[PDB]
Design a protein around this ligand. Structure first.
Ligand code: AX7
Ligand code: 0R0
Length: 185
C-alpha cells in the first residue's frame, strides 16, 4: 500500500475538490454490489454518519475469512491490503476502517488504521445472518478542503447504479439531517 500512500490522487482522484473523497464510497459500493448480487435478498445500505464516516452494508454471503495459503493471513485481510482500483486503496487512505463479516454462523471483526491491521481478523460471536459491513473514516491528512460528504453526489451515483444493477436494492441514509432514499429498479 505504500505506492498508494505516496500518490493518493493517482489512485482515488483529486484529494482537494471532493472527487477522491466521494470515489472512496463508490469503490466500496462496487464491492458491496458484487456481494449482494451473489445472495438472495440483494440489498445494500450506505450510511453517512454524523462523524463524517461512511458505512456500506451488504447481505451477501460474507467475504471469505480462511487463511490465504500464499499470503499467510485471512483472505479478507488480503482483499483489504493487497493491490476498479480496489478497496485496498480506500483502506490505505482511511485513518480508521472497521470490517465486520457474517459468515458460516460467525461474526468476524477487524480494525485498520491507515491500512494497517490492528490485529488479525477475529471471531467475536455467533450469528444466523450473512453479509459484509465496512465503515471507514477518510484520512484528513489526505483529503483537504472538501472533507465532508455531500448527500447529493452519493445519491446521484447510487441512482445510476440501481438502474444498471436492476434488482439490487440500494438504501442511502444520512444521519446528520435524517435524509434518506431507496433506489430500486
Ligand atoms: N497518522 C498516521 N498516518 C499514517 C500513514 C501511514 C501509516 C500510519 C499512519 N499514521
Ligand atoms: N463494504 C464492503 C465490501 C464488501 C466486499 C469486499 C470488500 C468491501 O469493502
Amino acid at each position: 500500500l505504500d505506492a498508494v500512500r505516496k500518490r493518493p490522487g493517482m489512485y482515488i482522484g483529486d484529494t482537494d475538490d471532493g472527487t477522491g473523497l466521494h470515489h472512496m464510497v463508490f469503490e466500496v459500493v462496487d464491492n458491496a454490489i458484487d456481494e449482494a448480487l451473489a445472495g438472495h435478498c440483494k440489498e445494500i445500505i450506505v450510511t453517512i454518519h454524523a462523524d463524517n464516516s461512511v458505512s456500506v452494508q451488504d447481505d451477501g454471503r460474507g467475504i471469505p475469512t480462511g487463511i490465504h495459503p500464499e499470503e499467510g493471513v485471512s483472505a479478507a485481510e488480503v482483499i483489504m491490503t493487497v493491490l476498479g482500483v480496489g478497496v485496498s486503496v480506500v483502506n490505505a487512505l482511511s485513518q480508521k476502517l472497521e470490517l465486520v463479516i457474517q459468515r458460516e454462523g460467525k461474526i468476524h471483526r477487524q480494525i485498520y488504521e491507515h491500512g494497517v491491521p490492528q490485529a488479525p481478523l477475529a471471531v467475536t460471536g455467533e450469528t444466523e445472518k450473512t453479509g459484509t459491513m465496512v465503515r471507514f473514516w477518510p484520512s484528513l491528512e489526505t483529503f483537504t478542503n472538501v472533507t465532508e460528504f455531500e448527500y447529493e453526489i452519493l445519491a446521484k451515483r447510487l441512482r445510476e447504479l440501481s438502474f444498471l444493477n436492476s434488482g439490487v436494492s440500494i438504501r442511502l441514509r444520512d444521519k446528520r439531517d435524517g435524509k434518506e432514499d431507496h433506489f430500486h429498479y
